[PDB]
């Protein structure tokens, strides 16, 4: 048995680290929280400090209104009875406003008005948070990569419950807030469009989804296979290539005769993943608006 | 129709993306070369990208890639066949000469500095507040090689300050001097530390660092390289 | 044929079989005994797939499809035309996949690095044998395996799926989808992180791992770390596939009814089973 570097053999701890200051407003940061021996077995143990600030709160708050809004409704359903509430948690659901109401914000609560309310909260909770991720990287002088790729995630989210419903002419086309409730909508959406497996974008979406798992498995295992030379210390290998970066490239060179660099691979990474919700967002925007049946479409091609 | 338009657009896009992504991963190691070190004929269909310069922090200067690729070190190897494609046998001690699994890269002979300009790594006996917070403490435990014999004993733990992580075990050998072993290369057991790669009589062969309070990117590579190659080369001792 | 820094690595040794026999390269490609095996099992198969194509009277790729023996043949061999070729090609595929894995082990031994890669690969190879070997054998019929065809194998997915209603209800399939989604989240993040540190705003200094750990705490309050995210990556991945191989080994062998029905156990619990109202009652 030889150490495989999955879990540390020895944990070490020094004074709580407050992190780089740069142009961050330490006034808005918080205080360091507890250390976690459990967490420290896989990664960092230091919990906190976290930067709250304004934008953060808008989201952190807005995000509870959306959570609670649907929560109230769930109880209205379980007849304020806990036993029930707990029993049918996955079955409850805050459906969207019936087709009759259209895109109007006039549908009553028990008829899809509550859905509108909650969603609104979510729309705030996510966007404000998005601006947060762009801001916190600026304060540190970093690129806006994290913020940009998060947009791609937002993309699919925007199409599923906003862009498309609007293009369809009804707040009904949206997705219900419910565990099993939304699983059904998903299976349902497909059957109504001629089986998405025929959607060329969907099949592409899957390609990347799987690709993301293929890539991260390779990358993670590689970086672990050469950590005996300091692999995880990626940024430095980027400014000064070491054996780690080399043996790492040669392995894939001799395996599939084609390879990457310590920085390049991350470009493959961020792109591999990002394309999952970008292509997905597309395949879905076109379904129901330009294409009605993907089987029928897979035939005439338009 | 729109759908069919969008789908083709995407394939053109993806192509440009695979082009971009490929030429980006050619910033190092390229242009290919023959076994003799001269530029190979065909360099593939992809062209080296325009160069890019990094601004290393702490006034360490800059880095431009792709740039002139050099090994800036001698290679003790000799061909084993007349044709291309075969192994290059070592012409001395692969471990000493540092070839094959024992290879190392000539990196800057300075240590890595944290976001503050301080040596990212330090022997724990020089690190404030730092202590073994969990797990077994190796300090004091003896060290054994793959030949079931004792090479020396751990006298301190070198840690990463900013990422609070153990990275090396400063071991004391029979003659009083110390050597760094990669944390990722030893089994800290109940009553010892086991080193599978090397075998007792080789712990002295491990490279040594100058200052006894900081390791340089270069020295890390020779220490790490040397121990890894002990996996292949030391074998003629690794009984167990 | 070599990268500026490659020669010092092309030393003798590392092979598991045959010794110095196949210990040599071919362009960037390393060979090894197992480099030969994969060629063998791959040329063999491709051929079988080519022949299997003429017997189907089609050369078109979006149509060709080697089908498995019909349920009547059970777990016995079948006529090259009635699932025979399929059965053989599966052997070639399996053997090609294994030889490839072990080839990586040798590429590993030569470079003196860990065996994490060939190990993580084995999890895929595992899922594969879960579909073409374990589930079918437990169900006693090579017919429960999937077909080899671009879209024709997609049908298999869809049919096998709707055979139990919305397959969304399979509990494990439910866990596997979560790790798959998370893995993409984690990959998207890690890449944006490292890159945003090595590629800061114009004219600025290259950040450090420190600015990385900083960035996340500010954002989410915690930061797993440079070694952790690579640990998380390998884990999220292999898990997503583990649970995927799992949700299919239980389907059709220990549970063969609608998956949405399996949630009754929950809803039909003494304490609330009859408690009037809700969604169920
Ligand atoms: C319709 C869909 C609309 C839906 C909206 C969802 C959009 C999701 C966007 C996701 C973006 C992720 C990008 C990753 C990335 O690099 O981000 C950093 C990158 C740089 O960040 P930074 O912090 O400013 O700079 C740090 C360093 O200075 C510099 O750091 P750096 O070096 O890392 O960054 C440089 C980066 C600069 O990044 C970009 O320029 C991004 C380009 C965005 C593309 C958006 C995709 C649209 C999908 C089209 C598909 C068609 C289907 C319909 O360069 C690239 O990555 C180049 C990309 C290669 C593109 C190849 C195109 C080929 C076209 C075909 C050519 C002919 C073929 C020949 C055969 O971000 C951007 O440039 C922003 C892109 C956002 C545009 C949004 C569009 C508005 C709506
Ligand atoms: C996992 C559950 C189902 C399944 C469900 C689906 C679904 C659902 C979809 C696919 C799709 C795909 N599947 Mg599948 N698929 C299964 C099992 C397999 C097996 C196998 C050996 O068992 C293989 C090779 C494939 C391969 C493929 C790809 C052709 C295509 C996805 C692109 C991708 O990014 O893939 C991930 C891999 C990479 C990014 C790595 C690169 C590998 C390349 C792409 C392989 C090409 C192989 C070529 C087409 C076959 C060559 C055979 C010759 C003999 C050499 N599937 C099982 C049985 N598959 C998608 C599609 O669009 O299909 C038409 C899709 O929507
Ligand atoms: C029976 C049903 C249909 C079907 C119907 C659909 C439908 C309908 C859709 C998909 C979509 C997808 N399908 Mg499908 N799909 C089927 C079968 C398959 C099979 C298979 C092997 O059979 C596979 C591999 C897939 C795979 C996939 C994915 C590639 C893709 C979703 C990517 C993603 O990450 O989304 C998840 C990611 C997001 C939704 C991102 C947005 C997240 C937002 C920004 C975050 C909000 C956060 C909130 C405010 C915070 C909560 C946090 C708190 C801490 C709690 N499908 C069958 C045939 N599929 C989706 C797509 O895009 O398709 C093109 C989609 O709409
Ligand atoms: C892409 C096509 C479909 C779709 C198809 C599916 C399918 C198919 C499945 C899910 C599943 C899930 N989907 Mg979905 N889903 C869609 C859009 C969304 C949106 C959105 C804002 O648009 C959100 C927030 C979600 C959220 C979720 C999760 C609740 C759940 C997956 C776990 C996970 O790892 O998530 C990634 C996110 C994180 C790791 C971070 C946040 C996770 C939070 C903190 C925890 C949720 C816990 C859950 C409620 C706990 C139950 C515990 C009880 C003890 C049993 N979906 C679209 C419309 N979704 C899975 C499931 O198990 O469903 C029942 C599943 O199989
Ligand atoms: C209508 C159909 C049903 C459904 C039916 C099924 C069925 C049926 C199955 C799945 C399976 C899966 N489903 Mg589903 N699924 C549905 C809806 C969804 C949705 C959604 C958002 O709606 C999602 C996210 C998913 C997600 C998933 C995945 C978790 C899982 C497949 C990945 C996998 O196993 O990889 C595992 C990876 C492999 C098997 C690949 C192995 C690769 C081998 C080793 C190498 C090949 C090399 C190649 C030949 C080499 C080429 C070389 C050349 C040089 C290029 N499903 C709907 C409701 N789903 C599958 C599963 O769990 O499978 C185990 C499965 O069987
Ligand atoms: C290729 C695209 C992939 C992707 C990328 C992605 N996601 C991202 C990012 C990126 C690049 C971010 O930067 C952003 C992030 O911040 O990550 C850490 C994020 C993010 N992706 C998220 C989710 C998510 N991503 C998903 C998917 C994907 N993300 C894709 C796979 C999914 C799926 C699969 O469905 C989900 C659910 C969010 C967690 C996060 C953005 C956070 C956000 O929008 O927050 C608004 C705030 C709230 C909703 C707060 C309330 C939350 C709960 C409802 C209540 C309980 C919490 C409360 C704090 C408890 C307090 C308890 C007390 C006791 C203290
Ligand atoms: C288990 C976790 C994840 C993972 C990991 C993973 N994959 C890996 C590795 C790892 C760690 C490798 O090291 C290895 C690699 O070298 O990658 C570059 C690989 C790899 N993952 C691959 C594919 C792959 N991985 C997938 C998934 C995953 N891989 C998971 C998400 C998928 C999916 C989900 O679709 C696919 C297609 C290969 C490209 C590659 C290994 C290549 C290899 O073994 O090559 C030699 C093989 C041949 C010559 C095979 C021919 C065999 C037969 C003669 C004919 C074909 C028969 C086959 C049944 C036909 C199928 C047709 C379809 C239309 C249905
Ligand atoms: C530490 O950083 C890292 C690196 O380096 C610094 C890396 O390189 C990589 C990996 C490298 C990449 C470039 C990532 C790219 C992205 C992908 C999504 C790759 C997977 C997709 C593919 C399409 C690869 C194609 C696969 C193969 C195997 C092509 C080989 C072609 C053949 C014809 C097979 C050869 C056949 C046989 C039988 C071998 C024997 C040969 C004889 C001649 C005999 C990672 C993850 C990394 O993290
Ligand atoms: C224990 O009890 C308490 C009280 C603590 C509460 C507990 C809470 C519970 C039990 C919450 C349960 C909620 C769940 C499980 C929610 C699940 C949601 C899921 C699975 C998916 C969500 C899909 C939604 C997407 C598609 C939504 C997209 C929304 C938008 C793009 C914005 C929509 C915009 C609208 C309607 C317009 C508003 C107006 C403007 C300004 C444009
Ligand atoms: Fe990385």
């Amino acid at each position: 048995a030889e150490y495989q570097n999955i879990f540390s053999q020895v944990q070490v701890r020094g004074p709580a680290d407050l992190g780089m200051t740069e142009d961050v407003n330490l006034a808005n940061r918080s205080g360091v929280g507890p250390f976690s021996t459990l967490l420290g077995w896989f990664g960092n143990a230091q919990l906190g400090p976290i930067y709250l600030g304004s934008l953060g709160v808008l989201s952190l708050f807005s995000g509870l209104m959306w959570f609670f809004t649907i929560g109230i409704w769930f109880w209205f359903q379980a007849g304020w009875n806990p036993a029930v509430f707990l029993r049918d948690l996955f079955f409850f659901s805050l459906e969207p406003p019936a087709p009759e109401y259209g895109l109007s914000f006039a549908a009553p609560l028990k008829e899809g008005g509550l859905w509108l309310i909650a969603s609104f909260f979510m729309f705030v909770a996510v966007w404000s948070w998005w601006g947060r991720t762009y801001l916190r990287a600026q304060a540190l002088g970093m690129g806006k990569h994290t913020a940009w790729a998060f947009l791609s995630a937002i993309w699919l989210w925007m199409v599923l419950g906003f862009i498309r419903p609007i293009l369809m002419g009804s707040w009904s086309e949206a997705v219900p807030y419910g565990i099993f409730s939304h699983l059904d909508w998903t299976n349902n959406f497909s059957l109504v469009h001629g089986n998405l497996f025929y959607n060329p974008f969907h099949g592409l979406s899957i390609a990347f989804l799987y690709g993301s798992a293929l890539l991260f498995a390779m990358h993670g295992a590689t970086i672990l296979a050469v950590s005996r030379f300091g692999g995880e210390r990626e940024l430095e290998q980027i400014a000064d290539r070491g054996t780690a970066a080399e043996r790492a490239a040669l392995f894939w060179r001799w395996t599939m005769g084609f390879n990457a660099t310590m920085e390049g691979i991350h470009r493959w990474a961020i792109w591999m993943a990002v394309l999952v919700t970008l292509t997905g967002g597309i395949g879905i925007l076109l379904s129901g608006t330009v294409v009605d049946n993907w089987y029928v479409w897979g035939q005439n091609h338009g | 129709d729109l759908a069919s338009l969008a789908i083709y657009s995407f394939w053109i896009f993806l192509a440009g993306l695979i082009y971009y992504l490929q030429t980006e991963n050619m910033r190092e190691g390229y242009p290919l070369e023959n076994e003799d070190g001269t530029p190979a004929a065909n360099q593939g269909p992809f062209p080296l990208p325009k160069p890019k310069t990094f601004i290393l922090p702490h006034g360490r200067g800059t880095l431009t890639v792709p740039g002139p690729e050099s090994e800036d070190r001698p290679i003790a190897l000799a061909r084993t066949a007349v044709s291309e494609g075969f192994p290059h046998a070592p012409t001395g001690d692969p471990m000493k000469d540092g070839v094959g699994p024992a290879s190392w890269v000539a990196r800057r002979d300075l240590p890595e500095l944290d976001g503050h300009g301080h040596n990212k790594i330090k022997p724990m006996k020089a690190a404030a507040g730092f202590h073994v917070s969990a797990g077994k403490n190796p300090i004091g435990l003896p060290v054994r090689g793959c030949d079931l014999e004792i090479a020396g004993k751990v006298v301190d733990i070198w840690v990463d300050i900013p990422e609070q992580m153990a990275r090396f075990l400063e071991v004391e050998l029979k003659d009083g001097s110390t050597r760094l072993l990669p944390m990722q290369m030893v089994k800290v057991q109940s009553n010892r530390v086991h080193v599978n790669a090397l075998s007792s009589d080789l712990f002295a062969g491990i490279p040594t660092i100058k200052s006894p309070t900081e390791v340089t990117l270069l020295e890390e590579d020779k220490i790490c390289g040397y121990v890894a190659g002990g996996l292949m080369y030391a074998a003629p001792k690794r009984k167990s | 044929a070599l990268l500026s820094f490659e020669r010092k690595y092309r030393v003798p040794g590392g092979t598991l079989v045959g010794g110095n026999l196949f210990d040599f390269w071919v362009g960037p490609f390393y060979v090894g005994f197992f480099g030969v095996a994969t060629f063998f099992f791959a040329a063999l198969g491709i051929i079988l797939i080519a022949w299997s194509a003429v017997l189907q009277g089609t050369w078109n790729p979006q149509l060709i499809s080697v089908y498995p023996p019909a349920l009547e043949y059970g777990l016995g061999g079948a006529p090259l035309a009635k699932g025979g070729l399929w059965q053989i090609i599966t052997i070639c595929a399996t053997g090609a996949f294994v030889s490839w894995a072990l080839r990586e082990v040798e590429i590993c031994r030569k470079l003196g690095i860990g065996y994490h890669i060939p190990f993580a690969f084995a999890f895929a190879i595992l899922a594969y044998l879960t579909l073409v070997l374990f589930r079918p054998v437990m169900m006693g019929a090579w017919g429960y395996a999937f077909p080899y065809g671009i879209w024709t194998h997609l049908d298999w997915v869809s049919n096998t799926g709707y055979t139990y209603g919305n397959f969304h209800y399979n509990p494990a399939h439910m866990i596997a989808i979560s790790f798959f989604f998370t893995n993409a989240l984690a990959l998207a993040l890690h890449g944006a992180l490292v890159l945003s540190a090595a590629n800061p705003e114009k004219g600025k200094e290259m950040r450090t791992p420190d600015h990385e750990d900083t960035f996340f705490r500010d954002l989410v309050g915690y930061s797993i770390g440079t070694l952790g995210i690579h640990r998380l990556g390998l884990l999220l991945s292999l898990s997503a596939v583990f649970f995927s191989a799992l949700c299919m080994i239980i389907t059709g062998t220990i549970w063969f009814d609608q998956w949405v029905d399996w949630w009754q156990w929950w809803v039909k619990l003494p304490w609330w089973a009859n408690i009037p109202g809700g969604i169920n009652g």
Side-chain angles (χ1 to χ4, degrees):
Chain A
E2 57 170 51
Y3 188 59
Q4 294 280 296
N5 214 299
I6 299 287
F7 303 132
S8 303
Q9 300 180 75
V10 178
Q11 285 196 54
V12 158
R13 185 182 314 172
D17 192 306
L18 308 306
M20 304 303 295
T21 301
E22 290 300 329
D23 302 305
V24 178
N25 170 62
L26 321 176
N28 287 313
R29 272 189 194 179
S30 78
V32 176
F35 286 76
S36 174
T37 299
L38 183 75
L39 292 192
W41 284 131
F42 209 52
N44 262 59
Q46 200 196 302
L47 287 173
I50 180 176
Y51 179 146
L52 180 56
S54 305
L55 215 62
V57 181
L58 185 53
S59 288
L60 191 61
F61 163 75
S62 196
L64 295 188
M65 285 318 291
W66 166 73
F67 191 63
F68 295 127
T69 287
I70 306 170
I72 296 301
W73 175 265
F74 268 36
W75 279 95
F76 196 129
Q77 300 189 295
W80 317 97
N81 188 327
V84 173
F85 184 80
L86 229 283
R87 178 197 57 184
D88 308 314
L89 198 56
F90 305 109
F91 303 72
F92 300 127
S93 173
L94 175 65
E95 295 307 318
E100 292 79 62
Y101 303 103
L103 290 184
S104 83
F105 306 67
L109 311 185
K110 299 174 189 52
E111 300 298 309
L114 208 59
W115 179 88
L116 288 146
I117 313 162
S119 295
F120 175 64
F121 282 126
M122 172 150 57
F123 178 93
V124 175
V126 172
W127 280 102
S128 43
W129 181 278
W130 177 80
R132 184 159 176 288
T133 107
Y134 174 103
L135 264 42
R136 297 298 131 283
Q138 194 183 50
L140 301 176
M142 291 167 110
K144 312 306 169 303
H145 296 49
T146 303
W148 282 142
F150 177 32
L151 189 55
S152 184
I154 269 159
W155 171 224
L156 176 57
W157 167 69
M158 281 300 292
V159 170
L160 282 179
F162 195 82
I163 308 172
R164 188 177 169 298
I166 271 182
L167 297 176
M168 297 301 263
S170 162
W171 282 146
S172 173
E173 283 304 303
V175 191
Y177 294 119
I179 300 304
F180 291 145
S181 177
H182 97 305
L183 292 185
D184 288 318
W185 179 91
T186 302
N187 163 72
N188 177 59
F189 186 99
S190 166
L191 300 178
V192 181
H193 291 83
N195 181 55
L196 243 58
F197 279 143
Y198 291 106
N199 191 316
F201 293 113
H202 180 267
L204 225 45
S205 192
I206 297 181
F208 302 125
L209 187 78
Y210 294 161
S212 295
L214 161 69
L215 196 58
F216 214 158
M218 284 170 56
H219 182 46
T222 298
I223 283 302
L224 285 188
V226 298
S227 55
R228 52 183 74 182
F229 309 117
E232 66 273 43
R233 289 156 68 194
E234 305 190 310
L235 285 200
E236 195 61 4
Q237 283 279 321
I238 292 182
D240 201 340
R241 189 188 67 230
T243 332
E246 301 200 340
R247 320 205 181 201
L250 285 184
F251 169 89
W252 294 108
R253 184 84 187 179
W254 304 344
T255 298
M256 54 184 220
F258 146 55
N259 63 141
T261 55
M262 191 59 71
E263 179 194 10
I265 183 53
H266 295 83
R267 286 178 176 298
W268 276 113
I270 183 184
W271 274 113
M272 178 61 93
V274 159
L275 296 169
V276 178
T277 46
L278 183 64
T279 309
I282 295 185
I284 302 303
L285 187 61
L286 295 169
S287 289
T289 58
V290 176
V291 183
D292 280 282
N293 201 296
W294 287 101
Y295 170 67
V296 178
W297 184 95
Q299 300 284 151
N300 307 285
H301 297 358
Chain B
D1 73 324
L2 277 174
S4 201
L5 182 78
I7 187 58
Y8 283 95
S9 304
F10 197 85
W11 283 89
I12 298 175
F13 168 82
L14 195 69
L17 179 60
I18 289 196
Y19 188 65
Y20 165 59
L21 279 168
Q22 185 45 42
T23 59
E24 283 307 291
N25 286 271
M26 285 175 57
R27 290 181 179 294
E28 288 225 34
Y30 285 66
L32 307 184
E33 42 186 78
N34 295 294
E35 315 207 311
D36 68 72
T38 52
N42 169 64
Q43 292 295 316
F46 296 113
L48 283 165
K50 305 160 180 297
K52 91 187 291 181
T53 305
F54 289 99
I55 287 175
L56 322 177
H58 313 306
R60 281 292 183 63
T62 66
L63 172 78
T64 289
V65 294
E69 301 294 76
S70 183
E71 293 281 87
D72 299 314
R73 63 163 292 197
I75 309 303
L77 300 169
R79 246 188 172 179
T80 61
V82 291
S83 50
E84 290 75 303
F86 296 75
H88 296 275
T91 55
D93 195 315
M95 303 261 54
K96 259 66 155 300
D97 306 324
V99 287
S103 287
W104 50 271
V105 169
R107 317 181 66 202
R108 282 175 313 189
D109 207 13
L110 300 171
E112 188 177 333
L113 312 170
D114 48 42
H116 294 97
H118 294 310
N119 285 42
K120 172 174 185 58
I121 306 181
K122 296 167 177 172
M124 184 169 51
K125 88 177 62 63
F130 286 79
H131 55 286
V132 177
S133 51
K136 173 55 194 172
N137 192 318
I139 299 189
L141 298 169
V143 176
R144 192 181 50 170
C146 64
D147 49 328
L148 303 181
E149 191 51 73
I150 299 302
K153 75 141 57 193
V154 199
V155 300
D156 190 25
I157 279 175
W158 287 52
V159 317
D160 192 305
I161 307 310
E163 298 178 51
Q164 316 208 355
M165 200 189 109
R167 286 184 167 294
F168 288 111
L169 285 189
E170 189 180 319
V171 169
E172 190 164 307
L173 303 181
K174 142 73 196 310
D175 66 52
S177 52
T178 62
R179 300 279 187 293
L180 305 198
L181 287 180
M183 208 39 223
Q184 302 87 316
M185 289 285 113
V186 299
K187 270 192 75 167
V188 182
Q189 308 170 318
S190 23
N191 53 77
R192 71 154 61 64
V193 175
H194 193 78
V195 188
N196 196 202
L198 314 168
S199 61
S200 67
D201 66 296
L202 289 165
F203 283 71
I206 307 175
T208 53
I209 55 178
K210 39 201 187 62
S211 162
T213 46
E214 61 173 48
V215 222
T216 49
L217 291 166
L218 176 74
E219 311 186 306
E220 286 193 61
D221 249 41
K222 309 190 193 181
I223 299 175
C224 288
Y226 180 90
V227 181
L231 286 174
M232 175 178 274
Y233 297 121
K237 312 165 194 58
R238 173 168 53 278
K239 55 168 57 57
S240 197
Chain C
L2 295 178
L3 301 165
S4 41
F5 60 81
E6 190 175 339
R7 198 182 176 194
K8 62 180 173 288
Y9 292 108
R10 293 208 174 179
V11 300
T15 53
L16 289 174
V17 179
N20 70 313
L21 258 300
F22 313 107
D23 188 35
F24 63 80
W25 288 258
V26 174
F29 293 106
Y30 177 65
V31 183
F33 170 74
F34 294 93
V36 176
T38 48
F39 184 65
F40 176 79
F41 287 124
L44 228 71
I46 294 167
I47 286 178
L48 290 215
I49 300 181
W51 178 19
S52 169
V54 310
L55 292 179
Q56 195 193 313
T58 186
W59 270 142
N60 188 76
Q62 290 192 62
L63 294 168
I64 298 177
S65 165
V66 174
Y67 280 89
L71 285 190
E72 4 297 332
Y73 288 108
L75 290 178
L80 290 202
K82 295 182 180 48
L85 284 187
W86 183 95
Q87 294 180 303
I88 295 181
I89 300 184
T90 278
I91 277 191
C92 289
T94 302
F97 297 154
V98 192
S99 301
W100 184 271
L102 296 166
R103 169 154 169 287
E104 297 190 312
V105 170
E106 292 197 327
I107 291 188
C108 271
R109 292 159 63 65
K110 188 168 287 285
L111 290 179
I113 61 175
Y115 301 122
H116 304 44
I117 305 174
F119 175 78
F121 178 40
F123 271 61
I125 287 194
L126 193 76
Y128 171 70
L129 295 177
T130 278
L131 297 187
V132 303
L133 197 168
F134 311 131
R135 185 171 175 271
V137 167
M138 290 184 71
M139 286 180 74
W142 301 112
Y144 299 129
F146 66 90
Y148 301 151
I150 310 300
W151 299 75
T152 105
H153 90 266
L154 270 272
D155 305 357
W156 182 85
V157 179
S158 217
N159 298 311
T160 302
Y162 285 119
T163 312
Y164 311 90
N166 187 336
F167 202 68
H168 278 158
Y169 289 88
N170 182 319
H173 176 275
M174 227 176 262
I175 286 171
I177 288 176
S178 310
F179 277 127
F180 261 96
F181 284 161
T182 299
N183 179 84
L185 204 188
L187 191 60
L189 285 184
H190 179 60
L193 194 67
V194 179
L195 286 175
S196 62
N199 289 291
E201 317 182 309
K202 176 195 169 185
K204 271 212 161 59
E205 286 186 310
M206 209 178 99
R207 267 78 274 271
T208 71
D210 303 33
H211 298 68
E212 285 184 293
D213 282 320
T214 300
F215 172 69
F216 260 118
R217 284 163 186 171
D218 291 9
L219 189 65
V220 305
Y222 176 79
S223 181
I224 212 174
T226 76
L227 177 67
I229 184 58
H230 283 80
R231 281 181 166 161
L232 184 57
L234 175 62
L235 230 75
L236 289 176
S237 279
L238 297 207
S239 288
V241 168
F242 181 70
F243 278 81
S244 276
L246 185 85
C247 83
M248 290 296 286
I249 189 58
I250 66 177
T251 286
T253 60
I254 74 170
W255 175 269
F256 39 86
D257 309 308
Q258 305 280 289
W259 277 110
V260 58
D261 279 337
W262 175 101
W263 301 82
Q264 277 174 57
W265 84 270
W266 181 246
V267 65
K268 314 296 178 180
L269 274 178
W271 356 320
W272 52 50
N274 315 67
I275 299 186
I279 300 287
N280 311 304

